[PDB]
């Protein structure tokens, strides 16, 4: 995370670390599923080792975490690894239910009228252990509050030469400031971009950290996140079909 500050205990109890050849993230749903990006779990399909999922800690290198393991991984069928960033979403079934506590609690899925809390300029929050402006992975879980960007502003920014056109779809949302600075960065992939439902006072996931410029926090680009509300039937059918 760029331009953020340290999480406190219990701020992001859904946040999970997924540690392998990469450092990446997800968000707990219920007690036995993790929501993440497809790109973050693709390369592991043919690995002998299950995904190493770590919950309940602020410190990246905590020896003190709650261990989970993948049992099954469901990558969206519309994800095409070698052709763009569309449909960047995946569900991980854990081998056992985790016991909930103040540091381990699932994020809510967006309700039907969640878009009312995800309007242009509404503030969402990205959290993670990814690259900070120190130039290293964060030792401590960080977060940043950033606004949802008008979808056509975001699309226009990623059409300005030399960016590759046609990268931003209807299944994505963008968050950040036009000036740059505050952003999600390498290592933050798969984390939940969350929003407050002020009627229930409960937090929900609107986005999954997906992609952006190679240089995070650059002016003229915005972090791009999978738009979770477009996947609710897919999510539901995976967690039923199971």
């Amino acid at each position: 995370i760029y331009g953020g500050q340290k999480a406190k205990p219990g701020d992001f109890p859904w946040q999970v670390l997924i540690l392998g050849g990469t450092t990446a993230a997800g968000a707990l749903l219920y007690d036995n599923w993790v929501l993440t990006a497809a790109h973050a779990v693709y390369e592991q399909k043919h690995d002998a080792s299950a995904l190493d999922i770590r919950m309940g800690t602020l410190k990246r290198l905590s020896p003190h975490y709650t261990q989970a393991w993948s049992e099954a991984v469901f990558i969206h069928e519309g994800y095409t690894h070698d052709a763009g960033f569309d449909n960047d979403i995946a569900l991980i079934k854990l081998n056992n239910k985790v016991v909930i506590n103040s540091n381990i609690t699932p994020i809510c899925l967006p309700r039907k009228e969640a878009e009312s809390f995800m309007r242009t300029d509404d503030i969402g929050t990205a959290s993670g252990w990814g690259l900070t402006q120190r130039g290293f992975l964060a030792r401590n879980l960080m977060y940043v509050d950033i606004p949802i960007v008008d979808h056509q502003k975001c699309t226009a920014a990623y059409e300005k030469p030399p960016y590759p056109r046609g990268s931003v779809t209807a299944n994505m949302l963008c968050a950040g400031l036009e000036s740059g600075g505050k952003d999600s960065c390498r290592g933050d992939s798969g984390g939940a971009l969350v929003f407050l439902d002020s009627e229930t006072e409960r937090w929900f996931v609107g986005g999954i950290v997906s992609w952006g410029s190679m240089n995070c926090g650059e002016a003229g680009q915005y972090g791009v996140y999978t738009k979770v509300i477009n996947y609710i039937p897919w999510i539901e059918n995976i967690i039923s079909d199971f």
Binding site: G21, E43, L137, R186, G187, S189
Partner: protein
């Protein structure tokens, strides 16, 4: 910090990128490649 073929999707170590129209830029996924 990159050289690539315009429009293509390509790997930058563990990340997936789409190359810019100048061949000297890209947009990429946000994994931290431990290697």
């Amino acid at each position: 910090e990159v050289t690539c073929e315009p429009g293509t999707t390509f790997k930058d170590k563990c990340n997936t990128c789409r190359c810019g129209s100048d061949g000297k830029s890209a947009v990429c996924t946000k994994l931290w490649c431990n290697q």
